Design a protein around this nucleic acid. Structure first.
Ligand SMILES: [Zn+2]
Lengths: 60, 206, 98, 113, 80
RNA sequence: CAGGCCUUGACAUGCUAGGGAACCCGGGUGAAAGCCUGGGGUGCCCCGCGAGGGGAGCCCUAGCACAGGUGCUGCAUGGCCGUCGUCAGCUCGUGCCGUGAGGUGUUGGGUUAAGUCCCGCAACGAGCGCAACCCCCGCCGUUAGUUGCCAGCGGUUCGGCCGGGCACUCUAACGGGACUGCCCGCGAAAGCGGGAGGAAGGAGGGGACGACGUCUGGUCAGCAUGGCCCUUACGGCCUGGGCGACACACGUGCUACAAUGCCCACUACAAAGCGAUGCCACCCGGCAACGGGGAGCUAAUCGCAAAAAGGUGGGCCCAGUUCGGAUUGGGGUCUGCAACCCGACCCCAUGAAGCCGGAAUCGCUAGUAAUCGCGGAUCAGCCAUGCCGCGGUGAAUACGUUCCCGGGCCUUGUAC
């Protein structure tokens, strides 16, 4: 989660396959989801803070 | 331990989302990212004004930002110039003709975030922790506010050992859904590290 | 012959918008098919509550989309101009297809 | 520290209005200035401690009327500040509490100027 | 393995050097880092110093080893 | 980790000099990264007839504040989480007792999942707790009928296919309903046994919800932050290797050891999801994975999608076997710049161990265990037999608390 690593993911790496996904909030690349572009921790925090429209605690 | 977020527990009922808009999977991420950026910029800037809440609305290729402030005098300025440049800033950041709005919070003693930042500033100014907490809880209790609770994290008075202080009075039923408990967290930075302050305020039922 | 799509995250505002549209159309001459409820779509996200370990925590979150349908029949010109003019609530999303 | 009801009486005897401005000298903690801000329009404070100032910076955070000037009361151009800050108020009062030793010289200066 | 439609893959930077060396006399100990390339009939009988991870190991190209890859003849882990 | 490179720089905010002042395409050396070196360029104002300039954003060079660090400290911290434990307990106000520390409440009898409730009682309450308020499943009703459905009609090239209709299922929103509510009997009451009406009967079945605190619990490698440490290196850029090694041991699982079975054909019945640089119907080539053509779908319409155990017919006849498919040799396909280390899948070839498993030990009380299949996240592809969900078939047994483990409350001896 080094800075240099953060900017390294924002350039076309000469081939398609080298490209990947980083969290847009903390720069994690271990639990990021395509839909939100956030890691699980950031997703949970933002969901709890109520800053995600329509996202709510699930129970069934 | 490990109590859950009191706001996230009541998203469905008695509390409402901060961001209110619809977007498909195609463009959810972009809208969320720009919303986060807007919130970051506004929280960085308007801190002096006593920020409460930032509501983001979208209708059709446009953004309607509502800002809850203790004292609108700071945000607006001497003849409504400050807001203008502020608007321009957002207009420069995301080119979708945002429409800034300001709302003043009635009796600022009944807003958990404001109490949070107040106590955080007190901590930052090397105040006495316990006395400040009692004062804060009493002040909240004076203005109705059927319940009040304030918690400080640790590292009290630059000590070597961290410890929670905690103080409350009134009814704070964290376990009931129909509670409408307002929640606020603030972080204080001092020469000897970081402190976390949490404030819950209980206002009626149903 | 005109179909009206209502998509939302909050069912209450969606119902309010659908009610407004149906009422306005009904006032404006010709009859309508009426609000047709559609099966809501659910996305689910299971995460670990902990930031490091304890993979037995797994808090849940859901994102649900609610759907409507209006299907105005026998379109009227002044009815048409009545549409695209009424300001919709912020959360609700509208679509028009013939 | 003084009883909270007496200060009300002094402020009443100042016949403070929502339109008038006040110059307050030596707020200290900031009892007086608080009970002014309410009924007053613009409060200016000349105060030099750096010790009770954090307390004072806090106590006045609610209000937007009060302002603090970190300048010597005696080593100040009172004309300059009075014209600069108060371009809007109709009338101006001065209500303060003085710290014994230097009480006569301040009043003498304000009157001779 | 290979799709057999797009042909056997060989690095251009190595193939070019091999062919030009073939055309003009001979040279020994051609150092390379390509672990991915495949043996071709155009470099049979030569020697390649392939980088296995710490130092180039010499490998002598025979006829029989035509169908295989460069790197497999270069050990990557030393046991005992 | 080995090797080859760079030093206000991969990234941010500011000064002092010069300038080719947004910069646009080539050539060498190389594994690239880089290092040099070529041709066309000024795209904004003011000024000066113009020539020239006064200047902007604007990239280079040299220096300045600097940035940067997955370096150390989780025994300096925030935040977040785990466990005791969803155990039932932890306190306060006023009043009473005692000179006081303090006690009562919170003890005693009974009953609950529960400090749940009743009675007694010098206490009456209240707060955080439990319960309830919230969500799903189960019955019914009112608005609403398209992409859903088809009972009664007319056609149908007989498939809801058309015309047609919201009766029924469904689909969503709002409500009703369960409250020991009615009766008999037993108790001083909380309650208990048995009935009736009801879809459901005595917290209807699950979920979300974690008290004051304990464990100097876990995380400085999500993030934020205090103090030390490095800044031609502990920073940064590329190639290759490694994280996947292997005399051995341990944990969690998958597939089996067969006849309640195995294999091959035909035929049925689900839910919950996902998909526009994706799903991919159908036709053709190939035994095949797949390739070529090629409609339709921002989706109750189209597709993934074949559901599998199940049923019917045929074969196998106790054999390391038509059990099992490990291991190994070839031939291919797909993704990807690139399948040796180290991908998946297809076809041919071979066919290991394994005859129900010591001491010991785990899970489960009903739609549960056991058993069968499907979907999603991530994802170019995938080592996923993992994780989170969905449905199909569907049991056995609880006499009792002696003993094993772990808790709660009430009683007694020696230290703070
Ligand atoms: Zn993150």
């Amino acid at each position: 989660a080094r800075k240099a690593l953060i900017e390294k993911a924002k350039r076309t790496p000469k081939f398609k396959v080298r490209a990947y996904t980083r969290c847009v909030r903390c720069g994690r690349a271990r639990s990021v989801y395509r839909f939100f572009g956030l890691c699980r921790i950031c997703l949970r925090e933002l969901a709890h803070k109520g800053q995600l429209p329509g996202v709510r605690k699930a129970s069934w | 331990g490990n109590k859950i977020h009191p706001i996230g527990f009541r998203l469905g009922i008695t509390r409402d989302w901060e961001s209110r808009w619809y977007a498909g999977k195609k463009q959810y991420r972009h809208l969320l990212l720009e919303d986060q950026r807007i919130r970051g910029l506004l929280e960085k800037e308007l801190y002096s004004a006593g920020l409460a809440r930032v509501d983001i609305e979208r209708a059709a290729d446009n953004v309607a930002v509502t800002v809850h402030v203790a004292k609108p005098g700071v945000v607006i300025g001497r003849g409504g110039e400050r807001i203008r440049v502020l608007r321009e800033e957002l207009a420069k950041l995301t080119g979708k003709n945002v429409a800034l709005n300001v709302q003043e919070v009635q009796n600022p003693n009944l807003s958990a975030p404001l109490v949070a930042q107040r106590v955080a500033e007190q901590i930052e100014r090397r105040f006495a922790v316990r006395r400040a907490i009692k004062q804060a809880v009493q002040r909240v209790m004076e203005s109705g506010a059927k319940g009040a609770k304030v918690i400080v994290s640790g590292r009290i008075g630059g000590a070597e050992q961290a410890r929670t202080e905690w103080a409350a009075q009134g009814r704070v039923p964290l376990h009931t859904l129909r509670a409408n408990i307002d929640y606020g967290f603030a972080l204080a930075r001092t020469t000897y590290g970081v402190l976390g302050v949490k404030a819950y305020i209980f206002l009626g039922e149903v | 012959k005109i179909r009206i799509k209502l998509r939302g995250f909050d069912h209450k505002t969606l119902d309010a918008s659908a009610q407004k549209i149906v009422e306005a159309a009904r006032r404006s001459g010709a009859q309508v098919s009426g609000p047709i409820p559609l099966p809501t779509r659910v996305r689910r996200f299971t995460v670990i509550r902990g930031p490091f370990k304890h993979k037995d925590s797994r808090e849940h979150f859901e994102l649900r989309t609610h759907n409507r349908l209006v299907d105005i029949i026998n379109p009227n010109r002044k009815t048409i101009e009545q549409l695209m003019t009424l300001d919709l609530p912020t959360g609700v999303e509208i679509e028009i297809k013939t | 520290l003084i009883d909270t009801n007496i200060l009300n009486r002094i402020v009443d005897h100042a016949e403070v209005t929502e339109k008038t401005g006040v110059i307050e000298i030596g707020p200290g903690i900031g009892a007086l200035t608080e009970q002014l801000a309410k009924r007053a329009k613009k409060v200016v404070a000349f105060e030099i401690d750096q010790r009770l100032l954090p307390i004072l910076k806090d106590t006045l955070s609610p209000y937007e009327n009060v302002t603090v000037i970190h300048q010597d009361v005696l080593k100040a151009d009172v004309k300059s500040v009075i014209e600069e800050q108060f371009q809007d108020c109709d009338e101006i009062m001065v209500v303060a509490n003085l710290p014994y030793y230097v009480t006569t010289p301040i009043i003498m200066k304000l009157l001779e100027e | 393995p290979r799709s057999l439609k797009k042909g056997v893959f060989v690095d251009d930077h190595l193939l070019e050097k091999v062919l030009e060396l073939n055309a003009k006399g001979e040279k020994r100990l051609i150092k390379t880092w390509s672990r991915r390339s495949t043996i071709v009939p155009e470099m049979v009988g030569h020697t390649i110093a392939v980088y296995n991870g710490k130092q180039h190991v010499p490998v002598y190209i025979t006829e029989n080893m035509v169908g295989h890859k460069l790197g497999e003849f270069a050990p990557t882990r030393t046991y005992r």
